[PDB]
Amino acid sequence: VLRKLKSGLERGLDTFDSTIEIIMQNLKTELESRCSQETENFLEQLISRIFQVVSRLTGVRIRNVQVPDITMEATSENSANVLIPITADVTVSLPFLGEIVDLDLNVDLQTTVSIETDTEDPQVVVGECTNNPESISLTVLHSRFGLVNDVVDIGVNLARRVVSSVVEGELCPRFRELLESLDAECVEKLIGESQ
Amino acid sequence: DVLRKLKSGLERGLDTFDSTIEIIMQNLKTELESRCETENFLEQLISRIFQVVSRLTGVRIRNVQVPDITMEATSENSANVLIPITADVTVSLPFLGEIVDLDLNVDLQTTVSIDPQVVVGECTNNPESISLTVLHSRFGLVNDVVDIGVNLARRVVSSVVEGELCPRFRELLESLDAECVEKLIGES
Ligand SMILES: [Ca+2]
Ligand SMILES: [Ca+2]
């Protein structure tokens, strides 16, 4: 079941792997130097370690995590969308059957950052990080049971449920936390550059 | 492994999970004694046994049927005793639910032989004597899904034969007196 994943996500998956918090602290530091491929590589490690815990709790094993490029798209002079594209390989295993499907995973995480207008002491507002099912894409690559066998659709739906739970419980919260660690002057500097 | 729950149940005895099993046993003993009917008590006993197995496993065996208990005299005072068993099997797995429907045939075979006591021979748990035929699967028959289902049912059926069905078969025959068994052998 997803019972073990539910409890793990309630505790926090970093309770299963103390190096997650260390990678988080490395990311915060690296980010403070934007305004003064390392960040992407820390994010790959972060996301990798998170999904490594998930593999211990579930049959959904996500690895080969790549983050090609973090980008910022200005939506005004005072706000921008921050995009984190994620790709990964997924293998779903079930009891007795072993490996039932191999999938290509694409997840696009997006969060807005905004700077208050009409002051020289501008506060920063990090917007919500939304777990839109359209942001999660799974492509069937292989199944030793046959590509059109019913077990494939079971594997796909199980992987989407797992990824969606992990995005809501871990990735989006950490994304917001990282952006909230940036300096007001830094976010200001970044939003302007994205126009 | 997966059969740990079944194995412990077989260690305690499956009648510890369903008090009606022993009642049928006594009914059978009386029924057999009466022949000096039985098939229906036999169906009931085997059915209840597999209903306990379904509480301990994903292998659900029901619609149990015993056509005719055959007895073939091998001498003046000995005979081969055959109980053919047919049943419907559904195997379930976590997540996937029911993976395969199977046709089961089991042949329970022993010997009875005649101051003088009634000897009941071995009850051999031969996997040649367990036949599982695939009827239906949601996941096709090309796959290893059916293979896993068949192998699961075979091991469950095999364990229950050795742990429950063959010992009970021997006890029921041992429960007849030398005169009773002598009369039944003659009726061939
Ligand atoms: Ca909490
Ligand atoms: Ca990289």
Numbering used by the authors:
A (entry chain A): 38 to 73, 80 to 238
B (entry chain B): 37 to 72, 81 to 158, 164 to 237
From the primary publication:
Further investigation of BSP30 revealed that it is a mixture of two closely related proteins—BSP30a and BSP30b, sharing 83% amino acid identity, with expression restricted to salivary tissue. Notably, BSP30a and BSP30b are abundantly expressed in the salivary gland independently of one another and the proteins are secreted into saliva, accounting for 15–30% of the total protein in bovine saliva. From a structural point of view, the PLUNC protein family belongs to the TULIP (tubular lipid-binding) superfamily. Each molecule consists of 7 α helices and 6 β strands as well as connecting turns and loops, which constitute the conserved TULIP fold.
Crystals of a double Phe-to-Met mutant of BSP30b diffracted to 2.0 Å resolution with a space group of C2 and unit cell dimensions: a = 81.65 Å, b = 59.57 Å, c = 89.94 Å, α = ƴ = 90°, β = 106.25°. The structure was solved using SeMet incorporated protein and SAD methods. BSP30b crystallized with two molecules in the asymmetric unit. Electron density for the loop joining α3 and α4 is absent. The hydrophobic channel of BSP30b (~22.6 Å in length) is enclosed by all of the secondary structure elements. The internal cavity has a volume of 90.2 Å3 as calculated by the CASTp 3.0 online server and the cavity is lined by predominantly aliphatic hydrophobic residues. This internal cavity has an opening located adjacent to the C-terminal helix (α7) at one end of the long axis of the structure. BSP30b also has a conserved disulfide bridge common to the PLUNC family (cysteines 172 and 225) that joins the long curved helix α6 and the loop region between helix α5 and strand β5. The first difference results from the presence of a second disulfide bond in BSP30b. This second disulfide bond, formed between Cys72 and Cys229, connects the flexible loop just after helix α3 to the C-terminal helix α7. Intriguingly the electron density for the disulphide bond is only clear in one molecule of the asymmetric unit and missing in the other.
